[PDB]
A paper describes a structure:
Respiratory complex I (NADH:ubiquinone oxidoreductase), the first enzyme of the electron-transport chain, captures the free energy released by NADH oxidation and ubiquinone reduction to translocate protons across an energy-transducing membrane and drive ATP synthesis during oxidative phosphorylation. Yarrowia lipolytica is one such model organism that is well established for studies of complex I. Complex I from Y. lipolytica contains 43 subunits, of which 14 are the core subunits required for catalytic function and 29 are supernumerary subunits with varied roles in assembly, stability, regulation, or independent metabolic function.
Here, we show that mutations of this arginine residue (R121M/K) abolish the quinone-reductase activity, concomitant with disappearance of the N2 signature from the electron paramagnetic resonance (EPR) spectrum. Analysis of the cryo-EM structure of NDUFS2-R121M complex I at 3.7 Å resolution identified the absence of the cubane N2 cluster as the cause of the dysfunction, within an otherwise intact enzyme. This feature is replaced in the R121M map with a feature that is narrower and elongated, and that no longer supports the presence of a cubane FeS cluster. While this unknown cryo-EM density appears to retain the coordination of C150 and C180, no clear connectivity is observed from the tandem cysteine side chains (C85 and C86), which would complete the ligation of the N2 cluster. The R121 mutation propagates destabilization through the NDUFS2 and NDUFS7 subunits, causing further localized disorder in the quinone-binding channel. We also note increased mobility in the β1–β2 loop of NDUFS2, known to harbor residues essential to quinone binding and catalysis, with only the backbone of residues 90 to 96 of the catalytic β1–β2 loop clearly visible.
Residue numbers in the entry:
A (entry chain J): 1 to 185
B (entry chain H): 1 to 341
C (entry chain Z): 63 to 123
D (entry chain b): 1 to 78
E (entry chain N): 2403 to 2871
F (entry chain A): 1 to 14, 49 to 128
G (entry chain a): 2 to 87
H (entry chain X): 2 to 172
Write the structure that this text describes.
């Protein structure tokens, strides 16, 4: 029973790979947006797996709830032509696709470590072998969760970033108006 | 995990049967308001009409137009039903008498009411014809414009109680229901609820498309049935949000003195009579608000899309971004900021 | 809160004692797995002379 | 036209009457939003002086004493 | 002061028609001047390089950042006078240079994002501010949506700027994965030597530097500066480069990088070579901005680079404004108008300008010889300081490449002057219309500073030896 | 196997023109949604940020009300009609 | 209320949800062993319920007032060995 | 710290304590009686708990190995408290913690039994409940006469006992 | 650390080798931001720190505003041209 | 099921729609029998060819009839739709809706009384009630 | 500014070693800063858990080949 829920993270990794390939290969872009929604869901799953369901839900109510609604809201209204995936047009990238894949992956994995010898920097990334003990202490007294902590630091320690994000959102209001709305009068 | 199966099947049966008879209740309530009667011929006083409409629609052809998609017109109603149903999990009928019993229940409902839009979005893509893709856009703009107003009320009341647990929000309403200090929010929440369900006086697209050759939900067979078990359940669900946010949920008269007088001990009878009283308060509240959906439908005429987007973004939102300032100030004036428990 | 505060030291005492028991038995275990070798298991990976619970182990299976 | 704008700088009070009559949906929103910060600034010290004061803060963590340890006994082994 | 400007303008512009846009620009111009006059005494706080941390540890205020703040305002009171004071009160120049409603708001928001970058002390403020500077400048390119080329430009700049914001955030998250910090003050000689962070910090430098046109990703930004309107090109081309270069200079990230040495060499070669065959003005000046970005990249490798940077960025900005201003004034004297947005494109349209307005050409020569590094013009004393610093720290091959790049760039800089002093038939003899007073006085003042500001070099050195030491 | 876990699996498995207000309503829904979602941490940390983070969120909301003010007075969301009713006057040259 | 025929379906809805809530109450109670369900449980309350499971023989929400623990309590201690996250 | 994430197998350790660390009894009382007795314990084990947390602070990392004596004295003080309760005030303690268990361990639902317990332990053991950090002005919530928040169902046995005790004058 | 790097790399490659349309470019940007947030939140859990989640929530805000501005810019392009062809920007 | 839910389509009600609307009225409620008029064929089962069926309209009628999903019936309300009635000899008339679509019940009248329409529906319910769906397969 | 804070709003897991390292940085000037090496190494060990991981790899090798 125990180990039925052991490889869920690897399953999500495999599924994210699939959804990326499907976003890239789909004919009609609407399907590609649906696969993007599948990917945001898989990410929300993985975040629940590692103990952050709050961000899973914030993702489902932000990305999926607004951004992807809007992406469909655009492609429904615009005449976005296409060119279905082919072999005459996209095969030429295979050598460069492969070289770029291998190098970018191995570098993105070696980068996170501080060893001086190169090969060991990757063999350290592949060392996911040992289990992390979880001890129980008794010092936390309140019912503070991640969202409460975020509110505390964001509204006390890092107030300036909040009072700048207000201006980012003012741009989000004011730029699209200026671009779309012609103030002829 | 047997009783977990029992508890699921009880809930699903109660909710789906409530939906089926909400259809009949809609029709008979609306009739008697119109000085007629009925359905009162398909059963013993019409209590089998809904199952007749179903069984007729399940023995009906599954016909797909030439230039249409099949998979999108099929799964999209199905996913609408699913998303509308999983919102029922976080809904309490007693103090902890909940299937989910999550600590993020508000946020779960709020994220699922954001997933709901996709049914209307994918409907227009079931018709490669050009006008349907603009009619769905009108009907999406109403929903995403009115979800801002429902949410804002979730946040306004959570300023009073700093917890996303639904049971905790209801237990703070022992002292007072939050419909007394924020009565205008009761109207606003009920208006926006009626809008999000695209119900009259906010039924712009279904009517505007019933005239035109398309731009509506021209489905048939089973997908019809699922869409009509997903409309009449999103109705109860949005009514429940009104209930556990503003009307005290399961709360009622203090049944302390009565249970003290009549029992003497905590038995498996008192627990039953308690859960009956709680759920009955929660149910009669849902009944009065489902009556109110019907009451509104019987009276008011329809809106146009310009009047409707103007209503939202120029009248409601300013009042709410005002209320966002008055209530925290009202707490700061009196040194009454709620704690995290 | 003040109730949970008056209870904390007791409960953390229990957890300290069980932390000591297990973190020492772990080293007495590896000693017996590293009998005939010059591998010091007591040599702390931390250069300070403080107590440090393992924070890692081998998977049980 | 029949009820156009007379301008805020050509009579404030006359503009406020026009707005309450023709644009309540903004006027009462402004009044709501101004009534919070202003009352918080003005009424708070009155409430602190006359009605009741501000509550003593909550522990938030173990209140570690600011002293040096004392030698005790009782409850020892044996 | 910026914020109260941005806040007030939103209300005051929404309340205002399309016909008040010039006066509103004039107002904010004068307001910025009153700030720069009345609040400038705050340089005293930075005596003996007293450095302050603000809003926790998110912001940092020293003499470097304050001077950059004054410079950005001096740029933004000159860039606003170009929109708020019409050159000639003719119908053509009304149609050619008319501000839009939201433009000024986007300018000030870009000023804010520029200043939050240089003042940043934590990567979170940097990421928020570079997104602000980036999004504002997507919209500024796109605000003139009645042109096809600008629409194409904003779209490309959005995508290729988004990719680099991804690269920057990937680098920051790596630094945090390694060290559990978002602050560069948590570095020092111990942590630099002890940890392999070279890759993790060059990725930051490149993700910031490819947003300013560093080679070999210069072309996309050059296509943008060419395709956008001239009075937008004069802003987008400068302010983003000041902000990001100043952040990279203040934070001594790349002390002796080999990658940076290679790329900076490539910029000097590309920006000097590829700009020789260009027949268009804006591409020519964009390749000029690139080679100057090469020179200023070369002092990311020094650890004592403030004076050389401050002197060069100041003269670069001045010469950059002045030359684009000369090009704007010359539109009256040409024969063919190419567009409503880019009236002047080809260098061969300035032919014979000496016979029309000669003192405009005197200004062009002063400015050109300043770019080349001819003394006693300020450009000499700027490129001299760079040569002092790199030779004092041990870069010799790069100094030769620097000399060679200056020589090669004289050719595309002198193309303008050569065609301008050429002869032309159908000269100007009289014109009852007259150019504006303010824009003439601004151009003159920039010319007189490029010419005679060598007189104050000792005085500047003394002030620097107090407030920066 | 929890009843939430049992339920959240069982249920699923058993050419043209437009007005720019149609598009602005969606494009503006994003930032206002991000505002109302960024307000969640405040309401859940409201006690711990007593009277400081209160003032901070008010300046937040006021800054956002500014952009709402800009939107209203531009009349972005209004639909504009082209076939206007004539209101010139009828004038006859004599 | 006059129109009983219209209120019957409301009586169905009212009685179905009513019996659903009372039956779920008895089922949760039988699950817990004669005690009302808990809610809004945090880290501490969960860790204490696990401690109760260590002191009683894994009997859920059964409580014990004894001042001294059975000797199994000292050896029933659990730590939790987590999978590495990737 | 955090909780387990994505997978976790409980694992025990069948070993014994080192011979250089003596033996100490465990409290063995569950969540509810312990929460009831929290105040009486803190009123009596205050110096011992404070000395425990102080030696944990002074050790600066080795608290788990240097503070054993102090934690031992704390555990013994606690055991003496609960033994005094069970010997003397048993039924009232049972009323309190059962009234709690039939709630969410909200103390608001158990004020009657809490009153009987405070009275008995103050008369016998001389230990009173006290919420510190308050001014003389603020009224502690367990002594309010008509509080806003009241339980869903006042417990039966608690109510009968409170009435009989007012009739007998014990309160 | 794995899943985020993989989505990021594959989406960068599908951004770079897209000869087809533009909505794929928008999507690949959003997926890159997603993978970043997953990397960062994994590290924030392992360190039991909050600065990671703060930067994550900030990324969500900034990415949504990014998509808003991008989809106004696209609408401007479409205003002028009427068709967004496969190989136009 | 087929009887208790009897949903016609809004099409066909051109002329003589008043008498059909009176069957939706209080004194004769059709909804009491489960009748609901629908905008769209695809959800409907029944077609009611009221009023004159003109030659400019017959193709639209046949489209709506082919669009309906089987099982499908037809009921002809009025004389002008059964045999052309009053305008039988006109140039712009189909002399019967039989010529286009197959008809199961013919209501007589001009305009047929609401009671005649209800009785016709009660004859149609009888037709479907003495229908063999599976018994015929057990013969076949 | 938000450094040294946990997900529950408290001190993180590796805060203490960071505190010792920051103390010894404040004690030392850039020349004497070499003394802060073992404190920094302890911090990095708490963060990334490398030397303990290699210790366990050696233990596992002894359980792996020397027995089978
Ligand atoms: C006690 C005194 C209370 C003062 C009340 C203020 C009266 C407001 C006057 C008014 O009615 O606003 C009308 C004004 C213009 O509207 P109109 O003439 O119809 O023309 C617009 C279409 N072109 O409308 C406008 O200019 C836009 C107003 C939009 C208001 C909606 C947002 C309300 C926010 C409430 C918070 C209040 C605090 C805001 C202050 C910001 C400070 C930074
Ligand atoms: C924006 C403008 C808002 C300004 C509103 C000011 C109104 C002043 C009303 C004064 C009534 C004072 C009555 C009173 O004494 O309240 C005390 C009482 C405390 O309850 P208690 O159990 O006794 O606990 C106290 C422990 N120290 O109860 C209280 O402390 C709270 C009393 C609340 C009074 C109503 C406040 C809201 C007024 C309507 C504005 C909001 C409308 C939306
Ligand atoms: C943003 C879009 C989203 C996609 C993101 C994709 C992932 C991003 C990958 C990482 C970030 C991109 C980095 C950009 C390139 C610049 C890197 C760099 O400049 O760092 C160099 C730096 C040393 O340079 P420096 O500090 O200047 O000089 C002192 C030298 N001792 O530091 C170094 O020394 C570098 C370390 C050397 C090891 C490099 C690793 C290469 C391993 C690849 C092996 C491939 C296998 C063989 C070929 C396979 C093909 C079949
Ligand atoms: C099912 C049992 C069955 O087998 O059905 C038996 C009957 C027949 O159904 P009916 O003909 O449609 O109703 C009669 C309609 N009179 C018109 C014709 O059901 C009923 O009346 C209702 C069953 C009880 C309702 C439960 C709520 C006059
Ligand atoms: C500052 C506005 C810049 C806007 C552009 C105008 C140029 C003004 C240069 C004055 C700099 C200064 O006087 O300062 C000297 C600074 C450090 O001094 P400080 O800390 O900034 O105090 C200054 C306090 N003020 C603002 C009240 C005066 O040394 C530097 O490295 C500056 C190198 C700049 C080289 C450019 C020379 C241009 C010739 C100027 C002829 C008047």
């Amino acid at each position: 029973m125990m180990y039925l829920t052991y490889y869920f993270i690897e399953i999500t990794i495999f599924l994210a790979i699939l959804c990326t390939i499907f976003i890239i290969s789909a004919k009609n872009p609407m399907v590609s947006i649906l696969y993007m929604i599948a990917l945001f869901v898989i990410a929300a799953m993985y975040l629940y797996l590692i103990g952050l369901g709050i961000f899973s839900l914030l993702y489902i109510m932000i990305y999926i709830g607004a951004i992807a609604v809007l992406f469909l809201f655009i492609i429904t209204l615009l005449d976005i032509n296409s060119t279905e995936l082919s072999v005459k047009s996209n095969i030429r990238d295979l050598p460069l696709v492969l070289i770029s894949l291998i190098v970018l992956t191995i570098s993105g994995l070696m980068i996170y470590s501080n060893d001086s010898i190169l090969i060991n920097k990757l063999l350290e990334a592949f060392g996911n072998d040992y289990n992390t003990i979880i001890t129980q202490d008794w010092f936390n007294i309140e019912n503070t969760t991640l969202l409460t902590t975020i509110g505390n630091v964001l509204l006390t320690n890092n107030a300036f970033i909040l009072l700048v994000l207000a201006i980012v959102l003012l741009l989000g209001i004011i730029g699209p108006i200026s671009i779309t709305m012609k103030h002829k009068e | 995990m047997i009783i977990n199966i029992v508890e699921i099947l009880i809930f699903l049966v109660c909710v789906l049967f409530s939906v089926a008879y909400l259809t009949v209740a809609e029709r008979k309530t609306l009739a008697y308001m119109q000085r007629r009667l009925g359905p009162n011929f398909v059963g013993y006083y019409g209590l089998l009409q809904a199952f007749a409409d179903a069984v007729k629609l399940l023995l009906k052809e599954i016909v797909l137009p030439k230039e249409s998609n099949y998979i999108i017109l099929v799964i999209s109603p199905l996913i609408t039903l699913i998303t509308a149903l999983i919102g029922w999990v976080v809904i309490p009928l007693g103090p902890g008498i909940t299937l989910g019993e999550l600590n993020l229940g508000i946020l779960f409902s709020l994220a699922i009411g954001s997933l709901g839009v996709f049914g209307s979005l994918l409907s227009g893509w079931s018709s490669n014809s050009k006008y349907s893709l603009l009619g769905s856009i009108r009907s999406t703009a109403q929903l995403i414009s009115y979800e801002l107003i429902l949410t804002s009320i979730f946040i306004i009341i959570i300023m009073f109680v700093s917890s996303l647990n639904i049971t905790t929000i209801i237990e703070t309403q022992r002292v007072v229901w939050y419909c007394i200090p924020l009565l205008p929010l009761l109207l606003i929440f009920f208006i926006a609820s009626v809008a999000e369900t695209a119900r009259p006086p906010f039924d712009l697209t279904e009517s505007e498309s019933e005239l035109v050759a398309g731009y509506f939900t021209e489905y048939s067979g089973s997908p019809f049935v699922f869409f009509f078990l997903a409309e009449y359940s999103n109705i109860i669900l949005i009514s429940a949000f009104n209930g556990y946010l503003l009307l005290g949920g399961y709360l009622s008269f203090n049944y302390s003195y009565l249970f003290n007088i009549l029992f003497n001990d905590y038995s498996y009878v008192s627990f039953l009579f308690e859960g009956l009283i709680n759920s009955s308060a929660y149910a009669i509240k849902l009944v009065f608000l489902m009556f109110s959906f019907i009451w509104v439908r019987a009276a008011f005429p329809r809106f146009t899309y310009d009047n409707l987007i103007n209503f939202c973004w120029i009248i409601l939102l300013p009042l709410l971004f005002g209320i966002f300032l008055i209530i925290p100030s009202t707490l700061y004036i009196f040194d009454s900021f709620p704690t995290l428990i | 809160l003040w109730a949970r505060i008056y209870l904390m030291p007791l409960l953390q005492a229990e957890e300290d004692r069980q932390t000591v028991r297990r973190s020492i038995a772990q080293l007495e275990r590896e000693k017996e797995i590293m009998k005939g070798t010059g591998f010091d298991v007591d040599k702390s990976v931390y250069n300070d002379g403080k107590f440090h619970a393992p924070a890692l182990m081998i998977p049980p299976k | 036209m029949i009820n156009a704008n007379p301008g805020f700088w050509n009579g404030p009070f006359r503009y406020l009457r026009w707005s309450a009559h023709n644009r309540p949906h903004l006027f009462f929103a402004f009044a709501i939003g101004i009534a919070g910060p202003v009352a918080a600034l003005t009424l708070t010290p009155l409430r602190r002086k006359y009605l009741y004061p501000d509550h003593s803060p909550l522990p938030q963590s173990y209140p570690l004493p600011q002293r040096a340890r004392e030698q005790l006994t009782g409850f020892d082994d044996e | 002061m910026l914020i109260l400007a941005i806040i007030s303008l939103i209300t005051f512009v929404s309340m205002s028609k399309l016909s008040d846009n010039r006066a509103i620009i004039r107002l904010i111009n004068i307001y910025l001047i009153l700030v720069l006059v009345l609040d400038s005494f705050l340089y005293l706080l930075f005596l003996n390089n007293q450095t302050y941390t603000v809003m926790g540890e998110l912001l940092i205020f020293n003499s470097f950042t304050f001077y950059i703040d004054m410079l950005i305002y001096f740029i933004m009171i000159v860039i606003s006078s170009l929109y708020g004071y019409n050159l000639y009160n003719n119908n053509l120049y009304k149609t050619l240079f008319e501000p839009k409603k939201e433009l000024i708001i986007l300018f000030l928001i870009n000023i804010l994002g520029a200043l939050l970058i240089v003042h940043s002390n934590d990567f979170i403020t940097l990421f928020v501010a570079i997104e602000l500077q980036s999004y504002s400048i997507y919209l500024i390119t796109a605000i003139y949506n009645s042109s096809y080329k600008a629409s194409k430009a904003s779209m490309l700049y959005f995508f290729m700027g988004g990719i680099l914001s991804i690269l920057i955030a990937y680098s920051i998250n790596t630094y945090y994965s390694v060290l559990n910090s978002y602050t560069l003050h948590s570095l020092d000689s111990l942590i630099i030597n002890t940890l392999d962070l070279n890759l993790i910090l060059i990725a930051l430098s490149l993700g910031l530097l490819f947003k300013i046109g560093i080679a070999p990703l210069h072309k996309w930004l050059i296509s943008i500066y060419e395709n956008t309107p001239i009075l937008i090109t004069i802003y987008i081309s400068l302010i983003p480069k000041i902000s990001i270069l100043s952040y990279l200079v203040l934070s001594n990230i790349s002390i002796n990088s080999l990658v940076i040495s290679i790329l900076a060499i490539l910029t000097l070669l590309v920006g000097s070579v590829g700009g020789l065959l260009q027949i268009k003005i804006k591409r020519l000046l964009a390749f000029s901005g690139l080679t100057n970005a090469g020179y200023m990249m070369l002092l990311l490798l020094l650890n004592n680079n403030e004076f050389s940077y401050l002197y060069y960025i100041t003269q670069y900005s001045i010469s950059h404004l002045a030359i684009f201003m000369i090009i704007i004034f010359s539109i009256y004297y040409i024969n063919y108008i190419n567009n409503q947005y880019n009236p002047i494109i080809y260098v061969n349209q300035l032919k014979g300008l000496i016979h029309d307005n000669a003192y405009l050409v005197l200004s062009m020569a002063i400015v050109v010889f300043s770019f080349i590094g001819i003394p006693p013009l300020l450009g000499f004393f700027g490129k001299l300081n760079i040569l002092m610093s790199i030779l004092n720290n041990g870069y010799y091959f790069i100094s030769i490449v620097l000399i060679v790049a200056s020589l090669i760039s004289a050719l595309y800089y002198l193309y303008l002057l050569n065609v301008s002093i050429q002869d032309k038939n159908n000269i100007l003899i009289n014109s009852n219309e007259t150019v504006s007073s303010v824009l003439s006085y601004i151009l003159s003042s920039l010319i007189i500073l490029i010419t005679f500001g060598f007189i104050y070099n000792s005085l500047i050195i003394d002030i620097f030896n107090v407030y920066f030491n | 196997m929890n009843t939430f876990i049992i339920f959240i699996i069982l249920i699923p498995i058993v050419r043209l023109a437009f007005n720019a207000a149609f598009i602005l309503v969606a494009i503006l829904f994003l930032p206002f949604d991000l505002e109302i979602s960024t307000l969640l941490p405040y309401v859940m940390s409201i006690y711990l940020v007593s009277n400081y983070g209160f003032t901070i969120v008010l300046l937040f909301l006021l800054i956002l009300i500014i952009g709402f003010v800009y939107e209203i007075n531009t009349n972005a969301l209004k639909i504009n009609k082209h076939n206007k009713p004539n209101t010139d006057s009828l004038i006859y040259k004599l | 209320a006059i129109p009983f025929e219209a209120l019957l379906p409301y009586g169905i809805i009212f009685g179905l949800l009513t019996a659903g809530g009372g039956a779920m109450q008895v089922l949760h109670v039988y699950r817990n062993g004669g005690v009302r369900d808990r809610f809004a449980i945090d880290q501490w309350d969960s860790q204490m319920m696990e401690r109760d499971l260590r002191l009683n023989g894994g009997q859920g929400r059964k409580q014990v007032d004894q001042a001294t623990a059975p000797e199994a309590f000292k050896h029933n201690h659990v730590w939790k060995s987590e999978r590495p996250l990737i | 710290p955090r909780e387990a994430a994505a997978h976790w197998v409980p694992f025990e350790d069948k070993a014994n304590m080192p011979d250089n660390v003596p033996d100490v009894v465990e409290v063995g009382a569950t969540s509810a009686p312990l929460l009831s007795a929290s105040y009486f314990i803190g009123a009596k084990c205050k110096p011992y708990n404070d000395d425990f947390m102080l030696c944990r602070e002074e050790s600066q990392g080795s608290g788990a190995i240097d503070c054993l004596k102090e934690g031992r004295r704390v555990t013994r003080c606690a055991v003496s408290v609960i033994e005094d309760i069970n010997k003397s005030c048993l039924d009232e303690f049972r009323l309190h913690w059962q009234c709690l268990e039939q709630n969410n361990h909200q103390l608001s639902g158990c004020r009657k039994a809490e009153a009987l317990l405070n009275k008995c332990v103050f008369t016998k053991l001389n230990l009173e409940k006290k919420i510190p950090g308050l001014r003389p002005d603020e009224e502690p919530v367990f002594l309010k006469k008509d509080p806003w928040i009241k339980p869903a169902v006042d417990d039966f046995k608690s109510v009968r006992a409170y009435a009989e005790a007012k009739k007998n004058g014990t309160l | 650390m794995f899943i985020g790097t993989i989505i990021l790399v594959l989406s960068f490659l599908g951004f770079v080798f897209n000869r087809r349309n533009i909505i794929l470019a928008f999507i690949c940007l959003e997926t890159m931001l997603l993978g970043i947030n997953l990397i960062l939140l994994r590290n924030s859990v392992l360190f039991d720190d909050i600065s990671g989640s703060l930067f994550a929530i900030v990324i969500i805000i900034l990415a949504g505003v990014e998509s808003a501005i991008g989809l106004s810019l696209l609408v401007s392009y479409y205003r002028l041209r009427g068709v967004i062809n496969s190989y136009g920007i | 099921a087929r009887q208790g839910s009897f949903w016609p389509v809004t099409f066909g009600l051109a002329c003589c729609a008043v008498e059909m609307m009176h069957v939706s009225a209080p004194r004769y409620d059709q909804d009491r029998l489960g009748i609901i008029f629908r905008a769209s064929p695809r959800q409907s089962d029944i077609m009611i060819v009221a009023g004159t069926l003109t030659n400019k309209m017959a193709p639209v009628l046949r489209q709506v009839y082919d669009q309906m999903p089987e099982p499908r019936w037809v009921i002809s309300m009025g004389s002008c739709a059964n045999g052309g009635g009053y305008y039988h000899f006109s140039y712009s008339v189909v002399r019967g809706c039989d010529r286009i679509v197959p008809v199961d019940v013919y209501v007589p009248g001009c305009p047929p009384t609401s009671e005649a329409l209800m009785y016709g529906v009660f004859q149609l319910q009888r037709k479907m009630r003495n229908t063999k769906i599976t018994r015929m397969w057990y013969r076949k | 500014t938000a450094a040294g804070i946990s997900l529950t709003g408290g001190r993180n897991r590796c805060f203490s070693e960071w505190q010792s390292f920051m103390h010894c940085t404040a004690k030392t000037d850039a020349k004497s800063r070499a003394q802060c090496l073992p404190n920094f190494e302890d911090y990095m060990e708490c963060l990334h858990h490398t030397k303990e991981k290699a210790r366990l790899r050696e233990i596992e090798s002894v359980l792996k080949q020397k027995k089978e």
